[PDB]
């Protein structure tokens, strides 16, 4: 159904892995199509132009020579309406880059170690979720520079948190990690909505109180029964979950029996599997799939440079798959990203190469 052609490739000069890539879906229509890549101590912006051109725009290089960025995510600046780019990695410091000036305008220290993923809330562009090697997720309000909530502890993850996603409504989060667990954390309670409201009301110039963070010790659901090894990428599909480990499949599943997501309580003993998307040669961890804006297609690169794209417009057992290869793309693909209009798919690799695929 979906066919793409490889129109160009570029390599960055640092020769370190590109761990992350994201198109800016928060651009204004008319704007050129821009994406960010992170690896080494760098964040780089590129624009896609005609005849396959991947045009270097500008870059931020961290003053710390031994920082290594792993992940980025785009949002809006609440003060101006223009885009912002959050980055983080091995140092465990969230940096908010203003992509206009390519300077760091805010940074957040708090995590005990490396940050593995960053996500923005789908309804509220100020609300940043980070997940960490310290076993916790944190929710920040980047307008008032406040830590709203820490998700961790008693029934929190017991090893590094590797990925998380908000659902479409931004009512709940699914996280996953090295403890081969997936954990659901609701954020639409009265308490949590009040906490977010208070975070906006906070101004340290008018008071000496600190801002009180919520400490959430108990997920609303937890399972270790989907995957056996490190779970490194999770994404909601409506009320269902897509997740993968290092076992060469993405599993489509739901908490409960074949059960309303919103009646699910922590005593739920079970899960239902609805389908799987099988592939090969993706058995190292920190390998992420993406979806298009409409969540009609799912793309994942593997450790030998193959790029799988599934048409999810289907019973998942029956989903059709396009395999995209190029004779010169042999290095491990860490992450992919579709343009907002789905016309372009970019893949980034361990050898610092970037691969541009255009929809036919």
């Amino acid at each position: 159904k979906y066919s793409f052609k490889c129109v160009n490739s570029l390599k960055e000069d640092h020769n370190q892995p590109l761990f992350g890539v994201q198109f800016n879906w928060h651009s204004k229509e008319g704007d050129p199509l821009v994406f960010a890549t992170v690896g080494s101590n760098r964040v780089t912006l590129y624009e896609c132009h005609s005849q396959g051109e991947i045009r270097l725009l500008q870059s931020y290089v961290d003053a710390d020579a031994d920082e290594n960025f792993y992940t980025c995510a785009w949002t809006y600046d609440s003060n101006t309406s223009h885009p912002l780019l959050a980055v983080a990695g091995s140092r465990g410091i969230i940096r908010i880059i203003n992509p206009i000036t390519m300077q760091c305008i805010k940074h957040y220290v708090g995590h005990g170690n490396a940050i593995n993923e960053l996500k923005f809330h789908p309804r509220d562009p100020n609300l940043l979720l980070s997940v960490s090697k310290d076993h916790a997720l944190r929710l920040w309000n980047i307008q008032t520079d406040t830590l709203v909530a820490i998700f961790g502890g008693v029934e929190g993850h017991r090893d590094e948190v590797l990925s998380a996603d908000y659902d479409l409504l931004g009512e709940k989060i699914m996280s996953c990690g090295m403890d081969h667990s997936l954990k659901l954390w609701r954020i639409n309670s009265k308490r949590m909505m009040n906490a977010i409201k208070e975070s906006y009301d906070y101004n340290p110039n008018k008071t000496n109180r600190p801002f009180i963070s919520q400490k959430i010790h108990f997920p609303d659901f937890s399972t270790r029964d989907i995957h056996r090894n490190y779970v490194d990428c999770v994404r909601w599909l409506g009320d269902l979950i897509l997740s993968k480990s290092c076992e060469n499949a993405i599993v489509c599943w739901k908490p409960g029996k074949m059960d309303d997501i919103d009646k699910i309580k922590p005593s739920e003993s079970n899960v239902t599997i609805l389908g799987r998307f099988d592939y090969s040669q993706c058995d190292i961890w920190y390998m992420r799939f993406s979806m298009d804006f409409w969540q009609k297609m799912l793309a994942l690169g593997n450790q030998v440079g193959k790029l799988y794209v599934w048409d999810l417009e289907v019973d998942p057992h029956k989903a059709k798959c396009t395999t995209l290869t190029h004779h010169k793309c042999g290095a491990a693909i860490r992450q992919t990203s579709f343009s907002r209009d789905s016309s372009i798919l970019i893949a980034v690799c361990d050898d610092a190469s970037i691969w541009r695929w255009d929809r036919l």
Binding site: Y230, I284, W285, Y286, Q303, A332
Partner: peptide
């Protein structure tokens, strides 16, 4: 498992 190939 391993992060690197």
């Amino acid at each position: 498992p391993s992060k690197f190939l």
